[PDB]
Ligand SMILES: Cc1ncc(COP(=O)(O)O)c(CN)c1O
């Protein structure tokens with residue numbers, strides 16, 4: 001049965017990682033990483049999370065299965081983060097949330113749900129995006145089409161190209177939007193651009209699918225949800241796939257959510273019953289520990305305050321590295337302005353380096369980025385910034 | 397897009413559960429439950445698990461993502477449980493294990509892997525089986541066909557009917573086997589019957605898929621794997637979907653494994669690369685906490701001993717209830733043979749009650765079983781056995 005199976009394509013991520021580990025040079029630097037690191041180069045467990053885990057160790061008396069949609073408090077806390085306390089969507093019971101194994105798990109549940117219960121055949125994704133978006137949607141039998149996004153000359157949102165691309169989208173297509181901190185570019189729509197897109201989406205009959213993996217890493221929890229909430233105010237229907245992997249530092253515990261929104265409570269409940277069937281046929285019901293930590297923290301005033309400040313510390317450290325990177329580069333020698341780095345949001349930015357410059361940075365200087373030129377600014381520290389920048393300047 | 401979606405079918409499980417909850421009668425009894433309960437009617441966190449969770453709280457310093465296939469130690473320990481320490485499959489590196497979100501997650505990964513990378517179109521499942529088997533395989537686009545299994549006259553394995561049924565299976569079809577503790581019947585092949593089936597499967601070109609959710613609940617860890625190991629000795633290729641939900645009491649942490657076996661190490665590694673691709677496009681990588689507890693316990697002599705004895709305590713309590721149920725039915729005036737209950741394995745048995753008897757049980761006596769007559773003998777205790785049996789005798 002298995003003798004003729006073709007090996008999966010290479011996987012550049014695992015990948016880049018292995019080469020970096022094998023590298024014997026001082027002082028090699030990994031900017032290809034996909035997680036947050038603090039100023040010491042570690043990805044610690046958040047203190048709020050440790051405190052919550054201690055509470056669960058002390059208080060859990062069973063591991064009995066959760067419901068298919070997971071912990072109810074997790075679902076309520078999730079909708080308040082997405083839509084805001086007092087949102088009409090919440091008041092009108094127009095939204096149902098399933099706890100999922102990570103943001104990826106939410107995307108796949110959304111995809112399976114749409115493939116089996118609607119006429120959706122196609123999902124529009126930005127070029128560039130997270131590379132697993134195409135894999136997830138194709139796995140459910142959905143075609144992925146790309147829309148233009150990045151102005152490589154100005155390192156900005158090519159808004160005109162975006163709108164032009166998306167005019168090829170038919171009514172009933174899904175259009176995926178990164179809620180904030182676009183991966184890989186760090187370039188997000190302004191609020192006014194979000195509002196324009198919301199209006200266009202209504203007119204053209206798109207189903208919006210928000211991928212919200214970095215809430216809190218651009219400007220703040222509420223600010224980062226402005227775009228989503230502009231869409232929510234304009235649409236009867238939408239889906240949100242959110243993730244707590246980065247903003248709770250809970251990557252490996254697989255903590256995310258798929259939130260379904262419809263015109264009213266009867267419609268969303270009926271539709272959500274099929275979303276639950278899609279979950280049942282995949283992993284049956286979701287892993288408690290990470291989501292329980294999230295619910296425990298979000299619903300406790302003391303823990304939530306500690307967590308919100310840890311998330312603010314992460315957001316602020318990323319911003320300090322963006323500033324320190326620009327200063328260190330090019331007040332000391334470099335190319336057509338790197339100030340675009342200060343305006344971008346989240347852990348990631350395209351550096352503007354070519355695939356060959358990136359290879360030369362790996363081979364000659366032991367500095368690792370992804371072939372697209374994406375760098376994770378949280379892999380930067382005050383201590384490694386000077387050598388990093390000296391290497392970059394050398395390949396310009 | 398969602399206005400015309402059809403509601404998912406009713407869900408008899410949630411279902412039975414809700415009706416039971418709402419029932420205001422003493423002394424209602426729930427035998428429809430799908431988990432272990434101890435003699436006090438609780439489903440505790442195992443002590444070994446609590447000890448491991450304390451160790452992880454003390455020692456974890458990151459939640460950074462696991463690899464796609466999860467914790468390596470979890471994989472090694474899983475293969476030793478399945479195949480035995482010193483198995484040729486292990487020595488010859490013919491097996492690859494992915495940590496998955498529960499046994500359900502393992503089944504879905506197997507199904508996606510098979511649908512996308514092989515010519516498999518059909519999976520044969522016993523009639524009866526766990527009702528989610530059909531949903532999982534269908535979700536991946538695979539047809540499910542049923543083979544005969546249960547002799548309702550003798551409360552035994554209808555081995556002739558099984559073999560006759562399966563002769564309609566074509567070469568290249570998947571045949572699913574429950575490894576031990578068949579759900580819902582508690583009826584397992586004898587070792588000689590497993591050996592006959594292993595020979596037949598080789599001759600007919602079936603791909604065996606073992607669903608191994610109750611290792612340790614029939615006779616013991618090694619004994620319960622005899623059937624699987626008889627197949628492993630005879631086949632180049634097979635898949636195992638195992639679960640740690642029941643035997644570690646880790647239901648909601650979603651802890652299972654999908655183990656792929658091929659003729660040699662080159663073939664299994666190449667095929668496993670596509671199994672990892674199937675995982676990546678689903679939930680990306682698996683939840684650490686439950687599997688880490690399992691690896692921590694299995695790889696530590698002290699914890700493993702505490703855990704093996706807790707599992708033995710569960711197996712033995714189930715056996716004591718089987719005996720007490722048969723004795724008490726006799727003593728309450730059932731004038732018929734229930735001795736078949738003593739020979740069946742695991743938490744579940746068909747009581748032999750009709751769907752109407754089961755409804756009458758619920759309505760007149762507040763005793764809840766599944767409509768098929770399946771009862772969970774771990775819902776039985778020395779204290780509730782007499783009323784339970786009085787009610788049953790009353791509807792015979
Ligand atoms: C845009 C985007 N979508 C989804 C994911 C997947 O997140 P998770 O690890 O929670 O599955 C990521 C990576 N955090 C991402 O960047």
Ligand SMILES: Cc1ncc(COP(=O)(O)O)c(CN)c1O
Pocket residue numbers: 283284497498499500501526574579607609639640641642647651652
């Ligand atoms: C035969 C069978 N297969 C798989 C499962 C699902 O197990 P899990 O909860 O680990 O996904 C069950 C329920 N334990 C089962 O009885």
